[PDB]
Amino acid sequence: PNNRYSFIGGRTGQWQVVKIRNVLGPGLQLVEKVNILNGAVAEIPLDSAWRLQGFASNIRYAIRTELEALQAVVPMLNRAEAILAVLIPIKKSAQWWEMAQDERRDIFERESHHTAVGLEYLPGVARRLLHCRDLGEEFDFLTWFEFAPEHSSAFNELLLRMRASKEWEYVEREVEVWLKRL
Amino acid sequence: PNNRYSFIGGRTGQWQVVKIRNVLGPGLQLVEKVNILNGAVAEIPLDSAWRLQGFASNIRYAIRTELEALQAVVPMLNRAEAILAVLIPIKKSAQWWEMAQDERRDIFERESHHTAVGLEYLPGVARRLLHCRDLGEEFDFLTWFEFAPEHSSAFNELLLRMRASKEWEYVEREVEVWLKRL
Ligand code: HEM
Ligand code: HEM
């Protein structure tokens, strides 16, 4: 299997763009669809507005008991019912990346309860975390969420709780690409 | 700045290959020299035998007090006297990468005291850690050490201690490329 994923905003793809919300910092040009490829894409179709990419990686913060709680409720991607998705690219500040591992873990979970909060929205919400700072990309992470319409309200609630977190004080660019499965 | 480094084994470079010691698992072909480039190289050069690459990244394990101690004593790269170097590509097992963050930190420092042991030798040894599992490379890490002859015996003692640690029970491929500055 290949750990690289590419998200190309343009006129083709498996996902229709519903809405792009430019939450913080420079946004992303509106496009019609998102095409998702499991691999690297050196050059995009010239009818494409942007390309984002990241890799699936190892665990950086979650501890064993947290992983065991997640595994108990985590849903799979590509559920038939999960016709809504959101792609949320995120960039954190240089101050964050300069911090040591204990400092970042303390903000992520002991102060912000990132995993404990997210667990409350499983199994409704399926997700994929990709990393891209080490690729030299403009964002540091591509986060992906998908779910049935019955969980839209809960997901909006989750977003409000996260954006109010200490961890968010270090986010410096964020965009939401709302999607509907074709 | 560019976070990517390539190490090309072949007939050109800043470092002469003294010997290659294929410590564990498949080795690396003997070559005359190692060429180090602060950038990606798309393909292995025609007459070169291999191309290793990795990126400099954020801290994964060290805590603030450890980083303070390290940053206070580590020497700069390219000291006049640091005419010896060793490039040690390392691969860890799938069992390692499936462990959680607390499980890996506990092996890396609580059990093995990797940083505390390294610190004993670090005043005279300049180091660079690079990551490459996430690039799809055959190794997980490229580690780089350079020092004066005066520190050769001490560096071998460090290697003796590290290969006996709990951490290295998870190393599954390792090569030593011993070098001398041209
Ligand atoms: C839906 C429930 C969620 C759960 C269960 C959850 C869980 C997790 C876990 C366990 C990690 C740590 C992975 C590791 O240790 O490497 C993580 C990372 C991350 N999550 Fe969430 N998450 C959820 C929702 C969200 C949302 C809604 C966002 C964005 C608004 C988000 C953004 C991120 C980011 C940016 C990271 C990377 C943090 C870093 O490495 O600095 N998560 N998530
Ligand atoms: C010379 C003194 C040394 C010091 C001060 C030292 C220090 C460190 C530190 C602080 C890290 C963790 C960086 C982080 O938190 O991400 C690290 C990682 C690593 N070091 Fe060393 N080290 C030394 C020698 C060595 C040697 C001789 C080897 C190889 C034989 C080695 C192989 C590694 C590897 C493979 C990693 C990555 C571990 C992982 O992420 O699983 N180190 N080192």
Side-chain angles (χ1 to χ4, degrees):
Chain A
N2 193 282
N3 70 0
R4 185 81 59 98
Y5 298 79
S6 294
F7 302 78
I8 298 139
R11 293 291 173 276
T12 63
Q14 318 96 330
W15 298 87
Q16 183 75 228
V17 170
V18 173
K19 171 160 72 133
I20 295 189
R21 188 177 78 203
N22 296 140
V23 175
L24 184 61
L28 290 174
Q29 195 201 114
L30 195 154
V31 305
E32 182 181 356
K33 299 175 180 194
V34 173
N35 187 22
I36 301 176
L37 304 171
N38 176 216
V41 171
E43 48 168 15
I44 62 177
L46 293 89
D47 55 39
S48 301
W50 40 261
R51 172 193 101 220
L52 309 174
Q53 62 164 349
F55 52 81
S57 196
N58 59 281
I59 286 293
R60 310 303 179 83
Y61 294 110
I63 70 184
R64 173 51 67 190
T65 55
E66 282 155 10
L67 291 188
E68 294 172 324
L70 290 165
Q71 183 60 234
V73 293
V74 61
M76 299 297 300
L77 293 159
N78 302 311
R79 286 171 300 182
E81 67 163 13
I83 62 176
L84 303 190
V86 192
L87 166 75
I88 305 182
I90 287 163
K91 190 190 181 103
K92 294 185 176 187
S93 70
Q95 183 183 15
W96 172 264
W97 292 112
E98 179 269 320
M99 263 182 293
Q101 176 69 20
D102 59 334
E103 300 175 323
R104 278 182 272 105
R105 163 67 196 193
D106 285 348
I107 290 157
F108 178 79
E109 200 61 39
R110 185 141 183 101
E111 291 299 318
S112 300
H113 309 293
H114 187 121
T115 297
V117 169
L119 270 171
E120 295 179 26
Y121 300 88
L122 276 50
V125 174
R127 63 183 262 272
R128 199 208 290 281
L129 172 62
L130 304 162
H131 304 251
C132 49
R133 183 172 185 258
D134 299 310
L135 298 178
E137 287 278 310
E138 292 181 338
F139 294 94
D140 298 331
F141 310 96
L142 309 176
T143 62
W144 174 269
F145 307 92
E146 57 179 65
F147 45 81
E150 49 176 319
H151 293 109
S152 296
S153 295
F155 189 74
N156 286 334
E157 169 184 297
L158 165 61
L159 290 181
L160 286 168
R161 296 176 68 184
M162 291 289 186
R163 265 67 178 270
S165 68
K166 175 62 153 203
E167 177 186 10
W168 289 267
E169 295 184 21
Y170 298 84
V171 166
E172 58 166 55
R173 198 181 165 198
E174 186 165 15
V175 180
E176 300 167 356
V177 182
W178 296 83
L179 301 168
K180 190 198 190 73
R181 202 171 73 203
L182 296 164
Chain B
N2 200 313
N3 64 346
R4 184 82 58 100
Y5 295 81
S6 300
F7 299 73
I8 309 169
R11 285 288 215 268
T12 56
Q14 311 99 321
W15 297 92
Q16 188 180 106
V17 173
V18 179
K19 73 180 170 189
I20 294 182
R21 195 202 210 263
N22 295 315
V23 167
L24 178 64
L28 291 177
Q29 191 183 321
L30 190 59
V31 293
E32 194 182 349
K33 303 180 207 251
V34 172
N35 191 17
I36 307 168
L37 304 174
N38 179 204
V41 180
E43 307 293 347
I44 309 179
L46 268 293
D47 65 350
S48 291
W50 39 265
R51 193 269 316 267
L52 310 171
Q53 61 172 345
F55 53 79
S57 192
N58 62 279
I59 287 290
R60 311 306 182 81
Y61 293 116
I63 69 180
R64 177 63 66 191
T65 58
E66 286 158 7
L67 276 193
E68 291 176 358
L70 296 160
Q71 282 153 9
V73 310
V74 70
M76 49 189 272
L77 296 169
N78 303 308
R79 285 165 304 165
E81 71 269 23
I83 59 164
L84 305 178
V86 67
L87 166 70
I88 309 181
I90 285 161
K91 196 181 183 194
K92 295 188 175 187
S93 65
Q95 183 197 5
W96 169 264
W97 290 113
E98 302 169 350
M99 286 187 278
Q101 178 63 23
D102 61 327
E103 292 171 329
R104 283 179 271 102
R105 160 68 190 193
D106 282 357
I107 288 160
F108 177 83
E109 200 62 35
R110 185 180 308 256
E111 297 312 317
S112 301
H113 290 296
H114 183 129
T115 295
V117 170
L119 276 174
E120 304 181 44
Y121 304 84
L122 188 64
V125 175
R127 57 177 285 278
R128 198 209 285 286
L129 173 68
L130 302 171
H131 301 254
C132 48
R133 183 175 184 255
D134 296 311
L135 296 181
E137 289 284 307
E138 292 190 330
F139 292 100
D140 293 337
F141 308 100
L142 304 177
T143 68
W144 174 266
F145 308 91
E146 59 179 65
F147 43 85
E150 299 96 6
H151 294 108
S152 285
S153 178
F155 189 79
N156 289 334
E157 184 187 289
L158 173 62
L159 284 180
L160 185 70
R161 297 168 70 180
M162 295 188 71
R163 269 59 176 278
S165 74
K166 189 78 198 163
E167 182 184 12
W168 293 98
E169 294 184 4
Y170 299 90
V171 169
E172 71 168 34
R173 195 181 172 194
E174 182 169 18
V175 177
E176 297 163 357
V177 184
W178 296 88
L179 301 167
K180 197 182 172 273
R181 195 168 80 206
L182 294 164

